[PDB]
Symmetry: C2
Subunit: 301 residues, 2 copies
């Protein structure tokens, strides 16, 4: 392994519904991270709201938390920070999903006011609870790695500017899939996969695995669609191919498994050339992220 | 801890990007001896220059391994040699009869069935077709190594020839194609020999308790054969849902993966009640059969 020993391996074969070829693990700091996530949930969502209820369901899987599993490769102190930061973005996603597109877009722009390198959380006490909570955890995530903070902020601003920026329904996967990689948060989550390991890829290194990284982003979001069906690839496929929902769900599963195979082919292609420890760490950590996401969805009640 | 004989080494399918199965793959410690026996029976049970002879060589040239030494890697090696060559003669027969019209194929099934007798005397078939001649010789050996199980084995083989290729028409729904394909791909024969190869049986009640699991695994086996041979359930799916081939191939892969999960669910349900060592032996060996078959088709 190229990753520090900060996770335990999970036995995915024991879960019948778990179909991914990729591994799953869980962070040695799971308890502390779950505790941090409970705290941020009580501060970033108001009591009795829908978003508060959706946050609590997200953190009550008996088999583990989405953050402690998917981001099990991260150093524990970074894991606590990135988990709580992404959690505020997830609360925000739940809040804005129930909004008309105009109001959602305004809410994304309001939250993005907090995304500043010089953020002073005290200047947002008059703001909504997601602004206040994001500001506090973003401050800490800047402090722990100031060298990476400009890139982090750029990634977060680009996420809020683009992840939701669509006018209506899709009718072909060729258009839905690039949208869905961004919409499921993969570019933010995979950024924090690297950040949580205190590492980066060079421009040349990232370019060399970009197709791999798109295939894994497809797996992540489309697997999210597959389990949620119990905006969705099942509907896109039904419309594109004029089939029943059961036929389209089976097609979606086939698409996911082929993307998992494609990622494995692209990784094998890259590993024919010399690969830095950073390239090897990202491969290992992003496979745990994707396999872990499949595991979490496969066990979540 | 393994419940089956220590007669195989594990294969790392994770290293094969096209390999998608959740089930494991292994390779017999007796692989060279079994492959030599198969090469010999292939010379005797198919004539030179024929298409079936050529198909037999392709089937035994995958550099990653042989279908018998991988899928039946759980078998005791002397039994593995016998069952591999017996099934291989049936496989040659399948290849020969696939190129015929249905009525002619069924006549050949009836002719081959004449050898499936508990008192088979191989010399009495020295004037028949080369499949009759070779099946007679290997059947006699397979009866003699286990006379207690031989009536059941013969009943299985007669049943296979009576059921695997009874449809000359076409399928328009998977609900009907799937039960047909489990028989047509030989799964009931192969899975019988997975137990026979380990010198064990399942009782009637034991088998009934895992029949739905077994059917799910049989669906995986034949439909995975279809998936890799498409480059067939893909055709059924295009006709049933009126889609392109590419769309139906993705639908087929989903159906396969769902069937692999369904098998895992059914096994987990069975294991909520007490299970004999024979049940556990079959679970582990049949998972190696199905995963190994995916591996062989993935690397062929």
């Amino acid at each position: 392994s190229a990753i520090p020993s900060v996770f335990e391996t999970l036995q995915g074969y024991k879960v019948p519904v778990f179909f991914s070829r990729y591994p799953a693990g869980i962070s040695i700091a799971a308890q502390e991270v779950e505790d941090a996530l409970r705290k941020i949930d009580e501060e970033a969502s108001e009591e009795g709201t829908r978003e508060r209820r959706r946050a609590l369901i997200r953190h009550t899987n008996p088999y583990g938390d989405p953050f402690t599993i998917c981001h099990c490769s991260a150093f524990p102190d970074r894991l606590a920070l990135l988990s709580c930061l992404v959690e505020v973005m997830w609360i925000h996603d739940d809040v804005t999903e129930e909004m008309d597109h105009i109001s959602a877009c305004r809410e994304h722009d309001e939250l993005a006011k907090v995304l500043q390198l010089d953020i002073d959380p005290s200047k947002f006490e008059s703001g909504n609870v997601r602004q206040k909570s994001l500001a506090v955890v973003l401050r800490k995530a800047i402090d722990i790695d100031p060298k990476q903070a400009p890139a982090m902020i750029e990634m977060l601003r680009h996420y809020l500017a683009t992840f939701d920026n669509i006018g209506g329904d899709f009718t072909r996967m060729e258009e839905y899939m690039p949208y869905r990689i961004a919409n499921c948060g993969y570019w933010m989550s995979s950024y924090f996969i690297r950040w949580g390991m205190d590492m980066t890829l060079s421009e040349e290194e990232y370019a060399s695995i970009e197709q791999f990284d798109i295939a894994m982003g497809n797996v992540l979001g489309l697997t999210n669609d597959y389990f949620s069906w119990n905006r969705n690839g099942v509907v896109v496929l039904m419309k594109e191919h004029h089939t029943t929902a059961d036929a389209a769900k089976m097609m979606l599963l086939g698409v996911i498994v082929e993307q998992e195979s494609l990622a494995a082919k692209l990784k094998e292609e890259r590993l024919k050339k010399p690969a830095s420890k950073e390239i090897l760490q990202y491969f290992e950590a992003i496979e745990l992220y994707v396999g872990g996401s499949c595991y979490w969805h496969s066990t979540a009640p």
